[PDB]
């Protein structure tokens, strides 16, 4: 829905790292591999957390109330 | 532009289809051991070419990763389970 | 995790793994039996039978 | 339709040259699916047939 | 066998014996017509058939893409340009012999090594 | 995924086209005269016969490829069986190639 | 197989031959009806030799001719006379049977009826000949395989 | 569905039609709701789902010697449906999912 | 790797053993098995080779 | 009352039908005695007829 | 249009190795099977040889022709069009003696109910007699082991009736029932007001219940045509 607070597997906080991940991709023109790593998402459990996240909240927000 | 055509099963009986374009168009005048063992482009009478063999599959089996690496019934079972699954079905 | 059963990370389940929402919708109508006679949506109470 | 006529070859009549590790070809995949489906039916049919056999 | 019809009727002809002269005749049963026979053969069965073997050998045979090709030289033109089939006689017991058609002289030849045909 | 089902075309433009492109009407068929003649069928109706189907097919195939004949219309030529079957027909399952 | 015969494959072959059902239909290439009015001569020049012999050490002018397959006769290890005698006993004194020898280029059986509306009768005989008649073997016993158990 | 509404529907009217009184051009309205407390207004899918109404439109034929025949349930995203010609932003407003 | 080379070869030689029979039957040299069609006989050998192959 | 005698045989056939169709409604080559709904009507027979009958 | 599935069977009587292997055909509203040759004469093709030419298109095909030799014999007892039509009309029933009844009945069946595609129009005997011939030709090609028996399961010879043709089946049923409702109001007019509900509610019932048949009395009627859309996953939808 929205970026999970913390990695399921190890519990490292990935809650802050969303907007910053997206700016590394867009503005910095970085690839996902280096972007995740710059944010310091070291183990693949944490990488899959952000890398594979679908931010549907953005679609839901588009509806009226 | 007549580069693509619609073919039913009755018409299919009169044509000869190539699977891949590139791997099924020139002719012989090394090979990767890891790769699967393919047939031949020996037919000089090719009328049509397949857009992609994976288009033989439908919605359900199209979610199966590497189904060409599974026993056929195991794919039939996963075709049935994707319905018993869960997630966002619509944003509204 | 024997015979098609599996072990799951309790720690991960907490952190939100495979947790889902579930909704059920219940419905009703004020039916009109004959003429003027109608059902009423109200909080009822112990009155006659 | 991917084969020429009167092709009695291992490749044409459904011999799956490959392993599951290597992956099946499109032809191999379909011929496997053809035989596979016969399994699922035969199973379905036997579950029925054996049911009654047990009861009688 | 051959099929002959009655003129002035176009109806089928039935055999009749000319016992006095010992000869076969074909009479019309719709009219007074009679004619001498051509062959003494009247009926033929053919249980082990060879007719139907090379069916549909249209001159457009070559334009069928579905048909396979070979590089065998023709017994006539010696062109290494062919199209082949086997059945056409869709019986159970049928041999696997191949029937080659030339995309030049248009003559049919068999891969038959045991038998020595002409058609 | 790529499958589609024929919606239903009108056979009349094809029938009108065939007669104008070498189709003898069934009522004028003389089998002893035209013994190699290819039978032309439109929606399981034997309309007549054609003496040079080769050219007729060439014309029809490129007529459909141009879009002048609806792309959903199926047209098959079984050379061996001396037959040309056409389907304007609704309900057929087709794929693109 | 009989106790003292288990090892002998030839004994086994003999029984296979004795029990496996064989019809006239299975050995026949084609069946033909001709109008050969003179029993002493023949319109068919192949049979010109066959007549000359089976007429050295009154009949129907209509002839029923059967061609037999050498290959079929060989798999079923049959003789022309074997086949012939079987036809002979099926119609007894009602059908006149002559046949070519196991050497002659073409394997033929010539049949004439004994003693108005006669041609139509031969077509009935050709059906009884192919369909009805049993050469060797036991009925229903259709294919017999040899196995070294 | 589109083939049926556009073409097939007109044919079904004009094949037995006329009596002893003929049927003409069939007109297919956009989906509507003929309700009491009012008369009729346009019915969008999300409304029909919630209010348990049928998403169908009016059927009109010219009778010779115009006329309401009944209501044809419309297929969603078809030629005659409102969503067919609607943008991503229109759907989100219409509470309909773009997907 | 070498065991894969050995398999690829095993399948290959079986395919050729099949072709050799396929041409033998097409040349009308193949003699039918007792109580079996030439076709029934050929097909039996083919599927026997292609199975022998998978097993090896 | 005024028995037309070929209207009596009519009502008698009807009584025979309802007494028949009450015990067994699924009669051989005869129409089903369907409800208002068109729903066939449970025969006493059908109640006891197995897998879900009183017995089974 | 119409929707009248009258199926025609062209049977080859007698098994392999049976005398008198005759060819008869299943005619709609005609109680008995008619020998092919009788039909051809009832269509105008009267001399057995013209009948043969409509069936076997090659005079060098002695094999196929020997198979039609008994057919000709089977038909021989009927030699004109009237004799042929009366024979068919007798097999229909109704003791309709004779010209304006028996014969006219046969004329009608051949025009309207025999091979209803092609044309149901008057003068198309040539067309229908060639097609019957093509059917016999195809039949014999199989009996002679030339062609193979048809695959009843070939997907190309199958159709899938989607949302539209299904709604079309219903609209025809309902609008024709509405036509009857209109025709009843006109007769009642011993001298507008047409029931709109029949079409609205009709389509509603079927799409609701999934029982593709009018309208509460849907038996025998196709059930499970219309079912609620699955919404667990986008892909499951
Ligand atoms: Zn982690
Ligand atoms: Zn005559
Ligand atoms: Zn040549």
Swiss-Prot record, chain A:
Keywords: DNA-directed RNA polymerase, Isopeptide bond, Metal-binding, Nucleus, Ribosome biogenesis, Transcription, Ubl conjugation, Zinc. Belongs to the archaeal Rpo10/eukaryotic RPB10 RNA polymerase subunit family. Component of the RNA polymerase I (Pol I), RNA polymerase II (Pol II) and RNA polymerase III (Pol III) complexes. Component of the RNA polymerase I (Pol I) complex consisting of 14 subunits: RPA135, RPA190, RPC40, RPA14, RPB5, RPO26, RPA43, RPB8, RPA12, RPB10, RPC19, RPC10, RPA49 and RPA34. The complex is composed of a horseshoe-shaped core containing ten subunits (RPA135, RPA190, RPB5, RPO26, RPB8, RPB10, RPC10, RPA12, RPC19 and RPC40) where RPA135 and RPA190 form the DNA-binding cleft. GO terms for biological process: nucleolar large rRNA transcription by RNA polymerase I; ribosome biogenesis; RNA-templated transcription; termination of RNA polymerase I transcription; termination of RNA polymerase III transcription; transcription by RNA polymerase I; transcription by RNA polymerase II; transcription by RNA polymerase III. GO terms for molecular function: DNA binding; DNA-directed RNA polymerase activity; zinc ion binding. Its main location: nucleus. Present with 5300 molecules/cell in log phase SD medium. InterPro entries: RNA_pol_su_RPB10, RNA_pol_suN_Zn-BS, RPABC5/Rpb10. The lineage of its organism: Eukaryota, Fungi, Dikarya, Ascomycota, Saccharomycotina. It comes from the Eukaryota.
UniProtKB/Swiss-Prot annotation, chain E:
This is DNA-directed RNA polymerase II subunit RPB9. Gene3D superfamilies: 2.20.25.10. It is found in: Nucleus, Nucleolus. The modification Phosphoserine is found at residue 39. It comes from Saccharomyces cerevisiae (strain ATCC 204508 / S288c). Keywords: DNA damage, DNA repair, DNA-directed RNA polymerase, Metal-binding, Nucleus, Phosphoprotein, Transcription, Zinc, Zinc-finger. A zinc finger (TFIIS-type) spans 70-110. Zn(2+) 2 binds at residues 74, 77, 102, 105. PANTHER family: DNA-DIRECTED RNA POLYMERASE, DNA-DIRECTED RNA POLYMERASE II SUBUNIT RPB9. SMART domains: RPOL9 (SM00661), ZnF_C2C2 (SM00440). Present with 2440 molecules/cell in log phase SD medium. DNA-dependent RNA polymerase catalyzes the transcription of DNA into RNA using the four ribonucleoside triphosphates as substrates. Component of RNA polymerase II which synthesizes mRNA precursors and many functional non-coding RNAs. Pol II is the central component of the basal RNA polymerase II transcription machinery. It is composed of mobile elements that move relative to each other. RPB9 is part of the upper jaw surrounding the central large cleft and thought to grab the incoming DNA template. Involved in the regulation of transcription elongation. GO terms for molecular function: DNA-directed RNA polymerase activity; nucleic acid binding; zinc ion binding. Component of the RNA polymerase II (Pol II) complex consisting of 12 subunits. Zn(2+) 1 binds at residues 6, 9, 28, 31. Its main location: nucleus. Belongs to the archaeal RpoM/eukaryotic RPA12/RPB9/RPC11 RNA polymerase family. The gene is RPB9.
From Swiss-Prot, chain I:
It is found in: Nucleus. The tandem 7 residues repeats in the C-terminal domain (CTD) can be highly phosphorylated. The phosphorylation activates Pol II. Phosphorylation occurs mainly at residues 'Ser-2' and 'Ser-5' of the heptapeptide repeat. The phosphorylated form of Pol II appears to carry, on average, one phosphate per repeat. The phosphorylation state is believed to result from the balanced action of site-specific CTD kinases and phosphatases, and a 'CTD code' that specifies the position of Pol II within the transcription cycle has been proposed. It comes from the Eukaryota. There is a cross-link at residue 23 (Glycyl lysine isopeptide (Lys-Gly) (interchain with G-Cter in ubiquitin)). Component of the RNA polymerase II (Pol II) complex consisting of 12 subunits. Interacts with DEF1; the interaction is direct and serves to bridge RPB1 to the Elongin complex in a DNA-damaged dependent manner. Interacts with the Elongin subunit ELA1. Interacts with the Elongin subunit ELC1. Interacts with ASK10. Interacts with ESS1. Interacts with RTT103. Interacts with SHE2. The C-terminal domain (CTD) serves as a platform for assembly of factors that regulate transcription initiation, elongation, termination and mRNA processing. Belongs to the RNA polymerase beta' chain family. This is DNA-directed RNA polymerase II subunit RPB1. It comes from Saccharomyces cerevisiae (strain ATCC 204508 / S288c) (Baker's yeast).
Swiss-Prot record, chain K:
It is found in: Nucleus. Residues 213-224 are annotated as: Fork loop 1. It comes from the Eukaryota. DNA-dependent RNA polymerase catalyzes the transcription of DNA into RNA using the four ribonucleoside triphosphates as substrates. Second largest component of RNA polymerases II which synthesizes mRNA precursors and many functional non-coding RNAs. Proposed to contribute to the polymerase catalytic activity and forms the polymerase active center together with the largest subunit. Pol II is the central component of the basal RNA polymerase II transcription machinery. Belongs to the RNA polymerase beta chain family. Component of the RNA polymerase II (Pol II) complex consisting of 12 subunits. The binding of ribonucleoside triphosphate to the RNA polymerase II transcribing complex probably involves a two-step mechanism. The initial binding seems to occur at the entry (E) site and involves a magnesium ion coordinated by three conserved aspartate residues of the two largest RNA Pol II subunits. This is DNA-directed RNA polymerase II subunit RPB2.
């Amino acid at each position: 829905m929205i970026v999970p607070v913390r990695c399921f597997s190890c519990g490292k906080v990935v809650g802050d790292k969303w907007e910053s991940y997206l700016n590394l991709l867009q503005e910095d023109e970085l690839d996902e591999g280096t972007a995740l790593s710059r944010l310091g998402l070291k183990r693949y459990c944490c990488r899959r957390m952000i890398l594979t996240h679908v931010d549907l909240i953005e679609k839901f927000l588009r509806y009226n109330p | 532009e007549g580069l693509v055509e619609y073919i039913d099963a009755e018409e299919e009986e009169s044509i000869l289809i190539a699977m891949q374009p590139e791997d099924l168009e020139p002719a012989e005048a090394d090979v990767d051991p890891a790769k699967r063992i393919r047939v031949s482009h020996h037919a000089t009478t090719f009328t049509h070419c397949e857009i992609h063999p994976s288009m033989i599959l439908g919605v359900a089996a199209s979610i199966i990763p590497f189904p060409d690496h599974n026993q056929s019934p195991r794919n039939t079972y996963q075709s049935a389970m994707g319905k018993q699954a869960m997630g966002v079905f619509l944003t509204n | 995790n024997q015979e098609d059963s599996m072990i799951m990370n309790q720690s991960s389940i907490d952190r939100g793994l495979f947790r889902s929402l579930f909704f059920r919708s219940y419905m009703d109508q004020e039916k009109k039996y004959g003429m003027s006679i109608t059902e009423t949506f109200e909080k009822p109470q112990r009155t006659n039978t | 339709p991917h084969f020429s006529k009167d092709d009695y070859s291992p490749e044409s009549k459904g011999f799956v040259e490959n392993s599951y590790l290597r992956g099946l070809t499109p032809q191999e995949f379909f011929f496997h699916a053809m035989g596979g489906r016969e399994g699922l039916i035969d199973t379905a049919v036997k579950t029925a047939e054996t049911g009654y056999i047990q009861r009688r | 066998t051959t099929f002959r019809f009655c003129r002035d009727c176009n109806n089928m002809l039935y055999p009749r014996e000319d016992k006095e002269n010992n000869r076969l005749l074909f009479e019309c049963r719709t009219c007074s017509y009679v004619e001498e026979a051509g062959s003494p053969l009247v009926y033929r069965h053919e249980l082990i058939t060879n007719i139907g073997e090379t069916a549909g050998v249209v001159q457009d045979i070559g334009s069928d893409p579905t048909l396979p090709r070979s590089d065998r030289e023709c017994p006539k033109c010696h062109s290494r340009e062919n199209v082949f089939f086997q059945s056409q006689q869709r019986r159970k017991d049928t041999s696997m012999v191949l029937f080659f058609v030339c995309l030049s002289c248009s003559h049919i030849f068999t891969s038959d090594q045991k038998n020595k045909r002409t058609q | 995924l790529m499958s589609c089902i024929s919606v239903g075309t009108d056979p009349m433009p094809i029938i009108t086209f065939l007669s104008e492109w070498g189709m003898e009407p069934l009522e004028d068929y003389v089998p002893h005269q035209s013994p190699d003649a290819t039978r032309v069928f439109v929606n399981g109706v034997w309309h007549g016969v054609h003496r040079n189907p080769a050219r007729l097919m060439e014309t029809l195939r490129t007529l459909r490829r141009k879009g002048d004949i609806n792309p959903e219309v199926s047209m098959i030529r079984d050379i061996r069986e001396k037959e040309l079957k056409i389907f304007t027909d609704a309900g057929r399952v087709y794929r693109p190639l | 197989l009989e106790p003292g015969h288990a090892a002998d494959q030839e004994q086994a072959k003999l029984i296979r031959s004795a029990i496996e059902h064989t019809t006239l239909k299975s050995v026949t290439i084609a069946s033909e009806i001709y109008y050969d009015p003179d029993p002493r001569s023949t319109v068919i020049p192949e049979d010109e030799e066959i007549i000359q012999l089976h007429f050295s050490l009154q009949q129907s002018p209509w002839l029923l001719r059967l061609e037999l397959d050498r290959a079929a006769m060989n798999d079923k290890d049959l003789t022309m006379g074997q086949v012939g005698e079987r036809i002979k006993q099926t119609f007894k004194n009602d059908l006149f049977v002559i046949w070519s020898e196991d050497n002659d280029e073409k394997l033929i059986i010539r049949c004439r009826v004994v003693r108005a509306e006669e041609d139509h009768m031969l077509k009935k005989i050709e059906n009884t000949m192919l369909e009805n008649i049993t050469l060797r073997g036991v009925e229903n016993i259709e294919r017999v395989v040899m196995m070294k158990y | 569905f589109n083939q049926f509404v556009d073409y097939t529907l007109q044919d079904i009217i004009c094949e037995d039609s006329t009596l002893i009184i003929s049927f003409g051009k069939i007109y297919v309205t956009k989906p509507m709701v003929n309700e009491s407390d009012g008369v009729t207004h346009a019915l969008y899918p999300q409304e029909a789902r919630l209010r348990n109404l049928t998403y169908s439109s009016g059927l009109f034929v010219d009778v010779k010697k115009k006329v309401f025949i009944g209501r044809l349930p419309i297929m969603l995203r078809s030629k005659n449906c409102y969503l067919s010609e609607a943008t991503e932003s229109d759907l989100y407003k219409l509470k309909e999912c773009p997907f | 790797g070498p065991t894969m080379r050995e398999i690829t070869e095993t399948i290959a030689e079986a395919k050729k053993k099949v072709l050799d029979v396929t041409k033998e039957a097409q040349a009308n040299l193949l003699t039918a098995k007792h109580g079996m069609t030439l076709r029934e006989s050929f097909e039996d050998n083919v599927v026997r080779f292609l199975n022998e192959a998978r097993d090896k | 009352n005024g028995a037309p005698h070929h209207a009596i045989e009519e009502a008698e056939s009807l009584l025979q039908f309802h007494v028949a169709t009450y015990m067994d409604n699924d009669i051989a080559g005869q129409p089903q005695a369907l409800q208002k709904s068109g729903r066939p009507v449970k025969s006493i027979r059908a109640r006891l007829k197995g897998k879900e009958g009183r017995i089974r | 249009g119409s929707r009248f599935i009258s199926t025609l069977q062209v049977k080859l009587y007698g098994r392999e190795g049976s005398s008198a292997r005759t060819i008869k055909a299943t005619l709609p509203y005609i109680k008995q099977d008619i020998p092919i040759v009788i039909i051809f004469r009832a269509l105008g093709i009267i001399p057995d040889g013209e009948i043969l030419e409509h069936i076997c298109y090659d005079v060098n095909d002695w094999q196929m022709l020997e198979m039609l030799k008994p057919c000709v014999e089977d038909g021989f007892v009927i030699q004109d069009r009237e004799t042929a039509l009366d024979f068919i009309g007798r097999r229909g029933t109704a003791l309709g003696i004779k010209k304006e009844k028996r014969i006219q009945y046969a004329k009608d069946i051949l025009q309207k109910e025999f091979l209803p595609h092609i044309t149901q129009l008057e003068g198309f005997e040539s067309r229908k007699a060639f097609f019957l011939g093509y059917m016999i030709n195809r039949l014999l090609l199989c009996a002679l082991d030339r062609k193979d028996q048809d695959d009843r399961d070939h997907f190309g010879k199958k159709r899938l009736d989607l949302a539209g043709p299904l709604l079309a089946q219903l609209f025809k049923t309902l609008f024709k029932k509405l036509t009857k409702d209109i025709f009843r109001y006109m007769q009642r007019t011993v001298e507008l007001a047409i029931n709109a509900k029949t079409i609205t509610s009709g389509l509603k019932y079927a799409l609701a219940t999934g029982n593709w048949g009018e309208q509460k009395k849907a038996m025998s009627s196709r059930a499970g045509v219309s079912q609620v859309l699955n919404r667990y996953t986008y892909s499951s939808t």
